[PDB]
Amino acid sequence: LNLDSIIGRLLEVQGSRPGKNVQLTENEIRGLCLKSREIFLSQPILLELEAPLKICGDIHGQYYDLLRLFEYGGFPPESNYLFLGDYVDRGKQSLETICLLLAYKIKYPENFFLLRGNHECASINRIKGFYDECKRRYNIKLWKTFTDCFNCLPIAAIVDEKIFCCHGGLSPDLQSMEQIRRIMRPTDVPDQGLLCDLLWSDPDKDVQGWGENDRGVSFTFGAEVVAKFLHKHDLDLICRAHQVVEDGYEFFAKRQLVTLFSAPNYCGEFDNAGAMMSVDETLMCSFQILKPA
Ligand SMILES: [Mn+2]
Ligand SMILES: [Mn+2]
């Protein structure tokens, strides 16, 4: 697997008209999936990470915005990175997006990290775009290969014992971090339970305790649920993604939770910015922001 050739071709379109494809070979992408899958399984499902690092929310196949994020934040390994999931679907270039991310994971496995979003799940990305991209530009066997890889992604991360990170949010079934560590891989995303909630739940300002989620999956949780979680586990901040927010980032529960969304102008019918959170050595948070067009 010629990793540097793959990364070079993926980065070659920097400065091109947004939309220009990078078409790797089928064997190259299969190798990216197989090798990254091995690395994901070799690392904990609950990552224990160190600052400084940069944290990114949803990308949803907006490959040229991913390139802008790296241009702003420093291409790996000049900065350490944690991504919070939802790499595919909706956008036009899920394939270039996920291939660059997997290539950086293989090249910099201790300095580059990917969590699982609810779209890294076959039943979701069958309908929402990624299956169609694979069928058109490669074949469905490659889509299954991607699925096998997604099923091994880690689910959450803790930065310096203080910042808890996942795609969705908290769970009424999450009482101990050991519950996350005991989750076995590979796995699909179940329709209920701890793993589902970590990828699907949402914070809600108008909810007390746990409420019903409008997505039809998982729950909503209020500010008191966040405060109790931080106190019980001696944490300072929940960092999650999953929801479009106008500024690219949005604090919640007196800045005890932050939502990150890194795909600007989402789907075309969203005038949102995309944001990336910079976490310095003392865990102080700042933002780099792709303003809407
Ligand atoms: Mn999303
Ligand atoms: Mn999501």
CSV table of C-alpha atoms and ligand atoms in Angstrom, one decimal:
chain,number,residue,atom,x,y,z
A,1,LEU,CA,0.0,0.0,0.0
A,2,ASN,CA,1.6,3.2,-1.2
A,3,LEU,CA,0.3,5.5,1.5
A,4,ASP,CA,2.2,8.7,0.4
A,5,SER,CA,1.1,8.3,-3.2
A,6,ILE,CA,-2.6,8.0,-2.1
A,7,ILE,CA,-2.3,11.1,0.1
A,8,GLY,CA,-0.5,12.9,-2.6
A,9,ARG,CA,-3.2,12.3,-5.1
A,10,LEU,CA,-5.9,13.2,-2.6
A,11,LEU,CA,-4.2,16.5,-1.8
A,12,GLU,CA,-3.4,17.3,-5.4
A,13,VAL,CA,-6.8,18.8,-6.0
A,14,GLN,CA,-6.1,21.6,-3.5
A,15,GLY,CA,-7.0,24.8,-5.1
A,16,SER,CA,-9.0,23.2,-7.9
A,17,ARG,CA,-12.6,23.9,-8.6
A,18,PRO,CA,-14.6,22.3,-5.6
A,19,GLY,CA,-16.0,19.1,-7.0
A,20,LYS,CA,-13.0,17.7,-8.9
A,21,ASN,CA,-12.8,14.0,-8.0
A,22,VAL,CA,-9.9,12.0,-6.8
A,23,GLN,CA,-10.4,8.4,-8.1
A,24,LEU,CA,-8.2,5.9,-6.2
A,25,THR,CA,-8.0,2.3,-7.4
A,26,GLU,CA,-10.4,-0.3,-5.9
A,27,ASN,CA,-7.4,-2.2,-4.5
A,28,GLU,CA,-6.0,1.0,-2.8
A,29,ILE,CA,-9.3,1.7,-1.1
A,30,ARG,CA,-9.7,-1.9,0.0
A,31,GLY,CA,-6.2,-1.7,1.5
A,32,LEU,CA,-7.1,1.5,3.3
A,33,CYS,CA,-10.2,-0.2,4.8
A,34,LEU,CA,-8.4,-3.4,5.8
A,35,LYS,CA,-5.4,-1.7,7.4
A,36,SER,CA,-7.3,1.0,9.2
A,37,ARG,CA,-9.8,-1.6,10.5
A,38,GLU,CA,-6.8,-3.5,12.0
A,39,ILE,CA,-5.6,-0.3,13.7
A,40,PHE,CA,-9.1,0.6,15.1
A,41,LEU,CA,-9.4,-2.9,16.6
A,42,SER,CA,-5.9,-2.6,18.1
A,43,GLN,CA,-6.8,0.6,19.9
A,44,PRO,CA,-9.4,0.9,22.7
A,45,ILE,CA,-13.0,1.5,21.8
A,46,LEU,CA,-12.8,4.3,24.4
A,47,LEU,CA,-9.8,6.4,23.4
A,48,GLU,CA,-7.6,8.1,26.0
A,49,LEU,CA,-6.1,11.1,24.3
A,50,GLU,CA,-3.8,14.0,25.1
A,51,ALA,CA,-3.9,17.7,24.3
A,52,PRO,CA,-3.0,19.7,22.3
A,53,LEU,CA,-5.3,18.5,19.5
A,54,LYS,CA,-7.9,19.8,17.1
A,55,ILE,CA,-11.4,18.4,17.2
A,56,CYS,CA,-13.8,18.3,14.2
A,57,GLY,CA,-17.5,17.6,13.8
A,58,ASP,CA,-19.6,16.4,10.9
A,59,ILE,CA,-18.0,16.4,7.4
A,60,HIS,CA,-20.7,14.6,5.4
A,61,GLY,CA,-18.7,14.2,2.2
A,62,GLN,CA,-17.8,17.9,1.8
A,63,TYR,CA,-14.2,17.1,0.8
A,64,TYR,CA,-13.1,20.5,-0.2
A,65,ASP,CA,-14.2,21.9,3.2
A,66,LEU,CA,-12.2,19.0,4.8
A,67,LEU,CA,-9.2,20.3,2.9
A,68,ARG,CA,-9.9,23.9,4.1
A,69,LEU,CA,-10.0,22.6,7.7
A,70,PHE,CA,-6.6,21.0,7.3
A,71,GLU,CA,-5.3,24.1,5.6
A,72,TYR,CA,-6.5,26.2,8.5
A,73,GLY,CA,-5.4,23.8,11.2
A,74,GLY,CA,-2.3,22.2,9.8
A,75,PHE,CA,-2.2,19.0,7.8
A,76,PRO,CA,-1.5,15.9,9.8
A,77,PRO,CA,0.8,15.4,11.7
A,78,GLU,CA,1.5,19.1,12.2
A,79,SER,CA,-1.6,19.0,14.5
A,80,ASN,CA,-3.1,16.0,16.3
A,81,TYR,CA,-6.7,15.4,15.2
A,82,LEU,CA,-9.9,13.9,16.6
A,83,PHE,CA,-12.9,13.6,14.3
A,84,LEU,CA,-16.3,13.0,15.8
A,85,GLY,CA,-17.9,11.0,13.0
A,86,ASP,CA,-20.4,11.5,10.1
A,87,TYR,CA,-17.8,11.5,7.4
A,88,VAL,CA,-20.1,10.2,4.6
A,89,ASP,CA,-23.6,10.8,3.1
A,90,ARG,CA,-25.4,14.0,1.9
A,91,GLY,CA,-22.3,15.6,0.4
A,92,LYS,CA,-20.9,15.0,-3.1
A,93,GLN,CA,-17.5,13.5,-2.2
A,94,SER,CA,-17.9,11.1,0.7
A,95,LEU,CA,-15.3,8.8,-1.0
A,96,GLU,CA,-12.5,11.3,-1.1
A,97,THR,CA,-13.3,12.4,2.5
A,98,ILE,CA,-13.3,8.9,4.1
A,99,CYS,CA,-10.2,7.8,2.0
A,100,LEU,CA,-8.1,10.8,3.2
A,101,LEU,CA,-9.2,10.2,6.8
A,102,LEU,CA,-8.4,6.5,6.7
A,103,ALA,CA,-5.0,7.2,5.0
A,104,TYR,CA,-4.0,9.6,7.7
A,105,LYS,CA,-5.1,7.1,10.4
A,106,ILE,CA,-2.8,4.5,8.9
A,107,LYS,CA,0.0,6.9,8.5
A,108,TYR,CA,-0.3,8.6,11.9
A,109,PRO,CA,-2.2,6.1,14.1
A,110,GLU,CA,-1.1,7.6,17.4
A,111,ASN,CA,-1.8,11.2,16.4
A,112,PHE,CA,-4.9,11.0,14.3
A,113,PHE,CA,-8.3,9.7,15.5
A,114,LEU,CA,-11.7,9.0,14.1
A,115,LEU,CA,-14.9,8.3,16.1
A,116,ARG,CA,-18.0,6.6,14.8
A,117,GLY,CA,-21.0,8.7,13.8
A,118,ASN,CA,-24.5,7.4,13.3
A,119,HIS,CA,-23.9,7.7,9.5
A,120,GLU,CA,-21.0,5.2,9.7
A,121,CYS,CA,-23.7,2.5,9.7
A,122,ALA,CA,-24.9,0.6,6.7
A,123,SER,CA,-28.6,0.9,7.3
A,124,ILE,CA,-28.2,4.7,7.3
A,125,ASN,CA,-25.7,5.3,4.6
A,126,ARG,CA,-27.5,2.8,2.3
A,127,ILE,CA,-30.2,5.5,1.8
A,128,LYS,CA,-28.4,8.8,2.5
A,129,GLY,CA,-25.8,8.8,-0.2
A,130,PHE,CA,-22.7,6.7,0.4
A,131,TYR,CA,-24.0,3.5,-1.0
A,132,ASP,CA,-25.0,5.4,-4.2
A,133,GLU,CA,-21.5,6.9,-4.5
A,134,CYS,CA,-19.8,3.5,-4.1
A,135,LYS,CA,-22.2,1.8,-6.6
A,136,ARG,CA,-21.6,4.5,-9.2
A,137,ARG,CA,-17.8,5.1,-8.7
A,138,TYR,CA,-16.7,1.6,-7.6
A,139,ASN,CA,-18.9,-1.4,-6.7
A,140,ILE,CA,-21.1,-2.6,-3.9
A,141,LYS,CA,-18.5,-5.0,-2.7
A,142,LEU,CA,-16.3,-2.0,-1.8
A,143,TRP,CA,-19.3,-0.5,0.1
A,144,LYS,CA,-19.5,-3.7,2.2
A,145,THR,CA,-15.7,-3.4,2.8
A,146,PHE,CA,-16.3,0.1,4.1
A,147,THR,CA,-19.0,-1.2,6.3
A,148,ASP,CA,-16.7,-3.8,7.9
A,149,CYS,CA,-14.3,-1.0,8.6
A,150,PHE,CA,-16.9,1.4,10.1
A,151,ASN,CA,-18.2,-1.4,12.4
A,152,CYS,CA,-14.8,-1.3,14.1
A,153,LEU,CA,-14.5,2.5,14.7
A,154,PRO,CA,-14.1,3.6,18.3
A,155,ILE,CA,-17.2,5.2,19.9
A,156,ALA,CA,-15.9,7.8,22.4
A,157,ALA,CA,-12.8,9.6,23.6
A,158,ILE,CA,-11.6,11.3,26.8
A,159,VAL,CA,-9.0,14.1,26.5
A,160,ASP,CA,-6.7,14.4,29.5
A,161,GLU,CA,-9.3,12.9,31.8
A,162,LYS,CA,-11.4,16.1,31.4
A,163,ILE,CA,-13.2,16.3,27.9
A,164,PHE,CA,-15.6,13.6,27.0
A,165,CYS,CA,-16.1,13.2,23.3
A,166,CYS,CA,-18.7,11.3,21.2
A,167,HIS,CA,-20.8,11.9,18.1
A,168,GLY,CA,-24.3,12.1,19.7
A,169,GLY,CA,-24.3,12.5,23.4
A,170,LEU,CA,-25.2,10.9,26.8
A,171,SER,CA,-27.2,7.8,27.5
A,172,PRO,CA,-29.6,6.9,30.4
A,173,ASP,CA,-27.7,3.6,30.3
A,174,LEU,CA,-24.3,5.2,30.7
A,175,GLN,CA,-23.3,4.8,34.4
A,176,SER,CA,-19.7,3.8,34.1
A,177,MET,CA,-17.0,4.3,31.5
A,178,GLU,CA,-16.3,0.6,31.8
A,179,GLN,CA,-19.6,0.0,30.1
A,180,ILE,CA,-18.2,1.6,26.9
A,181,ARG,CA,-14.9,-0.3,27.2
A,182,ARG,CA,-16.8,-3.6,27.3
A,183,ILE,CA,-18.5,-3.0,24.0
A,184,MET,CA,-17.2,-5.6,21.5
A,185,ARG,CA,-16.3,-5.0,17.9
A,186,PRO,CA,-17.1,-5.4,15.1
A,187,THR,CA,-20.7,-4.3,15.8
A,188,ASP,CA,-23.5,-2.5,14.0
A,189,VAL,CA,-25.3,0.3,15.7
A,190,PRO,CA,-28.3,-1.1,17.5
A,191,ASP,CA,-31.7,0.5,17.5
A,192,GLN,CA,-31.6,1.2,21.2
A,193,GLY,CA,-29.1,1.2,24.1
A,194,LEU,CA,-25.8,2.7,25.1
A,195,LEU,CA,-24.1,2.5,21.7
A,196,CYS,CA,-27.1,3.9,19.9
A,197,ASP,CA,-27.4,6.8,22.4
A,198,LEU,CA,-23.7,7.7,22.1
A,199,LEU,CA,-24.2,8.2,18.4
A,200,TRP,CA,-27.8,9.6,18.3
A,201,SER,CA,-28.8,11.5,21.4
A,202,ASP,CA,-29.2,15.3,21.5
A,203,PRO,CA,-29.1,18.0,24.2
A,204,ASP,CA,-32.3,20.0,24.6
A,205,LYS,CA,-32.7,23.3,26.5
A,206,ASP,CA,-36.5,22.7,27.0
A,207,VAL,CA,-36.1,19.1,28.4
A,208,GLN,CA,-35.9,18.2,32.1
A,209,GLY,CA,-34.1,14.9,32.5
A,210,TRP,CA,-34.5,12.6,29.5
A,211,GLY,CA,-37.0,13.3,26.8
A,212,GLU,CA,-38.2,11.9,23.5
A,213,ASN,CA,-36.0,12.5,20.5
A,214,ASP,CA,-37.6,13.9,17.3
A,215,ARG,CA,-35.3,11.7,15.2
A,216,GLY,CA,-37.4,8.7,16.3
A,217,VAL,CA,-34.2,7.2,17.8
A,218,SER,CA,-32.5,7.6,21.2
A,219,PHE,CA,-33.3,10.4,23.6
A,220,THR,CA,-32.9,14.1,24.4
A,221,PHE,CA,-31.2,15.2,27.6
A,222,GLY,CA,-31.2,18.5,29.6
A,223,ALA,CA,-28.6,20.7,31.3
A,224,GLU,CA,-29.1,19.0,34.7
A,225,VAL,CA,-28.2,15.6,33.1
A,226,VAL,CA,-25.0,17.1,31.8
A,227,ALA,CA,-24.0,18.7,35.1
A,228,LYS,CA,-24.6,15.4,37.0
A,229,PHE,CA,-22.5,13.5,34.4
A,230,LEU,CA,-19.6,15.9,34.7
A,231,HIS,CA,-19.6,15.8,38.5
A,232,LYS,CA,-19.9,12.0,38.7
A,233,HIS,CA,-17.0,11.4,36.3
A,234,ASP,CA,-14.8,14.4,37.3
A,235,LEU,CA,-15.0,16.0,33.8
A,236,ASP,CA,-15.0,19.6,32.6
A,237,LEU,CA,-16.7,19.4,29.2
A,238,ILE,CA,-18.7,17.2,26.9
A,239,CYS,CA,-17.7,17.7,23.2
A,240,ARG,CA,-20.1,16.3,20.7
A,241,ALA,CA,-21.4,16.9,17.1
A,242,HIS,CA,-24.4,15.5,15.2
A,243,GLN,CA,-26.5,18.7,15.1
A,244,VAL,CA,-26.2,21.6,12.7
A,245,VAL,CA,-25.5,24.8,14.5
A,246,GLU,CA,-25.4,28.2,12.8
A,247,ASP,CA,-22.0,29.3,14.1
A,248,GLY,CA,-20.3,26.0,13.5
A,249,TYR,CA,-20.1,25.6,17.3
A,250,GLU,CA,-22.6,26.1,20.1
A,251,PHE,CA,-22.2,25.8,23.9
A,252,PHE,CA,-24.8,24.3,26.1
A,253,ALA,CA,-25.6,24.0,29.9
A,254,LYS,CA,-23.4,27.0,30.9
A,255,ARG,CA,-20.6,25.9,28.6
A,256,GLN,CA,-20.5,22.4,30.1
A,257,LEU,CA,-21.2,21.0,26.6
A,258,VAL,CA,-20.2,22.1,23.1
A,259,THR,CA,-21.6,21.0,19.8
A,260,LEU,CA,-19.3,21.0,16.8
A,261,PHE,CA,-20.4,20.9,13.1
A,262,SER,CA,-17.7,21.2,10.5
A,263,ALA,CA,-19.6,21.2,7.2
A,264,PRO,CA,-20.5,24.7,6.2
A,265,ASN,CA,-23.5,25.5,4.0
A,266,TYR,CA,-24.9,22.1,4.9
A,267,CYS,CA,-26.8,20.3,2.2
A,268,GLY,CA,-27.3,23.7,0.3
A,269,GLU,CA,-30.3,24.6,2.4
A,270,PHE,CA,-28.4,25.6,5.5
A,271,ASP,CA,-26.5,29.0,6.0
A,272,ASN,CA,-24.4,27.6,8.8
A,273,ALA,CA,-20.7,28.0,9.4
A,274,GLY,CA,-18.4,25.0,10.0
A,275,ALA,CA,-16.1,25.0,13.1
A,276,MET,CA,-13.1,23.1,14.4
A,277,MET,CA,-12.1,23.4,18.0
A,278,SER,CA,-8.5,23.9,18.9
A,279,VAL,CA,-7.6,22.5,22.3
A,280,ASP,CA,-4.2,23.8,23.7
A,281,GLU,CA,-1.9,22.0,26.1
A,282,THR,CA,-3.9,23.3,29.1
A,283,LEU,CA,-7.3,22.3,27.5
A,284,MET,CA,-8.2,25.9,26.6
A,285,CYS,CA,-10.7,25.9,23.7
A,286,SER,CA,-10.7,28.2,20.7
A,287,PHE,CA,-12.2,27.9,17.2
A,288,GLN,CA,-11.3,28.0,13.6
A,289,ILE,CA,-14.3,28.7,11.5
A,290,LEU,CA,-15.3,28.2,7.9
A,291,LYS,CA,-17.7,31.0,7.4
A,292,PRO,CA,-20.7,30.4,5.1
A,293,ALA,CA,-20.5,31.6,1.5
B,1,MN,MN,-24.5,14.5,10.7
B,2,MN,MN,-25.0,12.4,13.2
